[PDB]
């Protein structure tokens with residue numbers, strides 16, 4: 001169906017952008033709103049309400065640019081805003097070598113049903129936060145499986 | 151001011167802030183503002199954004215060596231319609247010989263539309279505008295803003 005084709009196109013755009021950033025070790029933080037509304041966090045960023053593309057996702061996260069600091073939040077198959085604030089987790093069970101991007105992802109996942117993707121600037125490793133847990137060192141296939149399951 | 155007028159002012163402020171930032175850093179840029187002649191054919195050649203304007207997004211689009219930086223951004227009213235768009239190249243002899251493809255594309259679209267295109271030179275940081283087949287170079291910040299307000 002059209003709804004199904006659109007969801008698959010968005011998954012492909014996300015995974016292509018994540019692969020590019022993982023290869024270049026570009027830090028990234030991408031939260032996908034689900035049933036819990038995240039308007040309060042969307043409002044802290046720069047409004048985009050843009051069509052998803054791998055190109056736009058990559059351009060947003062380039063280091064030392066206006067939009068790269070903070071989270072992209074996606075809602076209703078669009079990029080709602082960039083450079084958004086997310087709350088930092090205080091969980092003592094996050095790997096101690098991880099920094100604020102990962103703590104922000106876990107933090108939003110503690111108070112919403114959202115799915116957040118993180119690319120590490122240190123290693124290019126890809127992780128996902130959901131339900132208060134961080135799933136680390138994902139393969140491309142693992143991330144795709146999580147997006148399709150979501 | 152009406153909301154339409156306020157939105158137009160917000161969009162002009164976003165554009166001028168972005169152009170000033172890129173000019174200072176010699177970031178090449180090509181930004182076409184659709185007017186009454188529709189530019190759908192050219193919009194459809196690029197990557198669709200249909201995004202709210204911000205200075206931040208305009209700057210992020212044109213950063214060198216990124217997916218969206220080559221080609222034109224085309225704006226429709228208060229939105230960035232698409233990036234990395236094709237525009238036709240002018241053959242006008244009144245384009246300074248040292249100028250490259252962004253300036254020629256800007257003049258080219260200006261010959262077949264009533265659009266206003268802004269160009270930032272990656273060589274000099276100079277700012278120019280193409281309208282109605284003419285290129286006006288080395289604009290001050292004030293001159294650009296006045297041209298946009300008049301547009």
Ligand SMILES: COCCOCC(=O)Nc1cccc(F)c1
Pocket residue numbers: 015018019020022023124125126127137138139140141142143
């Ligand atoms: C040019 O292709 C680059 C692909 O990089 C893949 C890579 O190193 N890490 C990676 C990418 C996507 C998801 C994931 F869990 C991990």
Ligand SMILES: [Mg+2]
Pocket residue numbers: 287288
């Ligand atoms: Mg002069």
